[PDB]
RNA sequence: GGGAGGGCGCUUACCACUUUGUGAUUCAUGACUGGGGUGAAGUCGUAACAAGGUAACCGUAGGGGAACCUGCGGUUGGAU
């Protein structure tokens, strides 16, 4: 890996794209004309790419590609013309600059963008067995930081009841109070599937939830053809296409939105609400904890700031230094 | 006169082909699979080598979606 050699190399790969696009036959013979595509499936060593034509091609990925991931739309080739026609045979000559995308946190292994070109990131979730706002709280900051739109969807609502929902919806009202988008539904039950469908209308976004939040239900509910197995018990990079438009990078991980450490002054910018809680405090450097005359504290224990949000926000900062 | 004798002849014995059984051996066919070979992922995890960050390892039990867990016995192939 060579930042320098990597650099000079970058320019080369870039030119290769524009140069190849200039026009074809000089390129030719083994492979066919270049075309655009996005990465639906990751074969570790291969990738399924959907072409402009709309037909997916499993392709090789020339070493010259530092990396690739799902949600990556860009130029591509298959082998020849003839070669795609017997058996999905294609190769990815180069990629495009991911306009909108996000990565996963990790521990040893470094942050890796999960998907690119995202208009909205709908946080799944599920009532079974029990939610944890924390997971959603940390996710809220991510959506703000990548400047992506967030949709929280309390799913599997059909599983709740009298003393079950009256505590679910309300408890989630927080999102409806601070201006967030949410739509209670139950894949098993197909309820509130109208609102979501419209929300996903003309947009490029995807859904990720925590361990077992009904991600397979919703993705399989909106549009499911010859493939409805991704439920079933409690268990587990392909970005599937939508029934009403939009795609959703599903890989068995993403739904488990962890939490990575970006900066120590950003955490305060995570929530817009803080725009009024970070005005005047007791200590110029008051981390908002046990200071005398704080602002965020005087608001929390005052009824305006949701206590639950305080504990979660404070825990997030203590989670980073966990390294 | 003929006669012995022989052939023709039938039949007997051995038995070739081959049908009933009875199976034995392989070729294939295929409902169905263990578990192998690969790596430019996600996780969900911190597993082995440090005291590696549930000493390790061995037998075997029960247990557990995932590496693993654990009872039981054993050891020195475990930092101080
Ligand atoms: O059992 C299955 C479901 O039957 C059930 N399930 C899904 N939707 C619903 C629902 O609406 N209601 C109920 N009761 N169960 C549901 O919830 C479980 C999870 O469904 P999955 O589709 O696999 O969820 P992910 O795809 O998000 N998971 P990963 O990110 O790891 O791929
Ligand atoms: Zn303060």
Q: A131 C-alpha to center of ligand 1: Å?
A: 14
Beta-bridge partners for A51:
A37
Q: How far is residue A281's CA from residue A298's CA, in Å, rounded to a whole number?
A: 9
Do A68 and A39 form a contact (C-beta atoms < 8 A)? yes
Cis amide prior to A129 (ω within 30 degrees): yes
What single string gives the DSSP state of each residue in A80-128?
TTTHHHHS--EEE------SSEEEE--SSS--EEEEES-SEEEEE---S
Method: cryo-EM
Q: A51 C-alpha to center of ligand 1: Å?
A: 30
Query: Which nucleotide is nearest, taking the CA of residue A64 and each C1'?
Result: B40
- Any binding-site annotation on A205? no
Closest CA to A216 of A238, A199, A200, A246: A238
Instruction: Look at the alpha carbons of A112, A196, A145, A72 in this order and tell me if their dihedral is positive or negative.
Output: positive
* Å separating the CA of residue A233 from the C1' of nucleotide B71: 28
Query: Which nucleotide is nearest, taking the CA of residue A104 and each C1'?
Result: B42
* Å separating the CA of residue A158 from the C1' of nucleotide B30: 45
Query: Which nucleotide is nearest, taking the CA of residue A106 and each C1'?
Result: B43
At residue A43, φ and ψ (nearest 5 deg) are -95, 40
Q: Which bases of strand B sit closer than 7 A to a protein CB?
A: 39-46, 65
Structure tokens at A111: 């942050």
Q: How far is residue A51's CA from residue A71's CA, in Å, rounded to a whole number?
A: 13
Do A160 and A127 form a contact (C-beta atoms < 8 A)? yes
- Any binding-site annotation on A288? yes
3-state secondary structure of A170: helix
Show which residues sit with Cβ under 7 A of nucleic chain B.
Answer: A 42-46, 60-65, 67-69, 104-109, 112, 114, 211, 234-237, 251-254, 256, 258
Pocket test for ligand 1, best of A212, A218, A234 (most atoms within 8 A of CB): A212
Which DSSP state fits A224?
-
User: What are the distances in angstroms from CA A196 to CA A107, A181, A204?
Assistant: 34, 10, 13
Which DSSP state fits A279?
S
Residue A131, classified by CB atoms within 10 Å of its CB into exposed (0-12), middle (13-18) or buried (19+), is middle
């Amino acid at each position: 890996l060579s930042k320098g050699q990597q650099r000079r190399v970058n320019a080369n790969h870039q030119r290769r794209l524009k140069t190849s696009k200039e026009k074809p036959d000089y390129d030719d013979n083994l492979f066919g004309e270049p075309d655009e595509g996005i990465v639906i499936s990751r074969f570790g060593m291969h990738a399924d790419v959907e072409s402009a034509d709309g037909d997916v091609h499993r392709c090789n990925i020339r070493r010259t590609i530092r990396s690739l991931v799902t949600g990556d739309r860009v130029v591509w080739r298959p082998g020849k013309p003839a070669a795609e026609g017997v058996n999905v045979k294609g190769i990815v000559e180069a990629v495009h600059e991911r306009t909108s995308v996000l990565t996963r946190p990790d521990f040893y292994d470094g942050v890796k963008p999960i998907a690119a070109n995202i208009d909205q990131i709908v946080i799944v979730s599920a009532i079974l067995p029990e939610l944890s706002l924390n997971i959603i709280d940390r996710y809220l900051v991510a959506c703000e930081t990548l400047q992506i739109e967030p949709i929280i969807v309390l799913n599997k609502i059909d599983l709740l009841d009298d003393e079950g929902m009256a505590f679910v919806n309300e408890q989630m009202d927080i999102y409806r109070n601070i201006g967030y988008r949410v739509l209670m539904v139950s894949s098993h039950t197909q309820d509130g599937l109208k609102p979501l469908e419209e929300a996903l209308t003309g947009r490029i976004s995807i859904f990720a939830g925590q361990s077992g939040v009904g991600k397979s239900s919703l993705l399989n509910a909106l549009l499911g053809l010859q493939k409805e197995i991704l439920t079933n018990d409690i268990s587990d990079a392909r970005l599937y296409h939508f029934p009403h438009g939009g795609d959703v990078i599903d890989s068995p991980g993403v739904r488990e939105f962890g939490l990575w450490h970006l900066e120590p002054e950003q955490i305060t910018q995570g929530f817009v609400e803080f725009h009024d809680y970070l005005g005047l405090c007791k200590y110029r450097d008051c981390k908002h904890d046990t200071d005398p005359g704080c602002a965020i504290r005087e608001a929390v224990e005052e009824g305006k700031i949701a206590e639950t949000r305080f504990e979660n926000y404070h825990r997030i900062l203590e989670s980073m230094a966990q390294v």
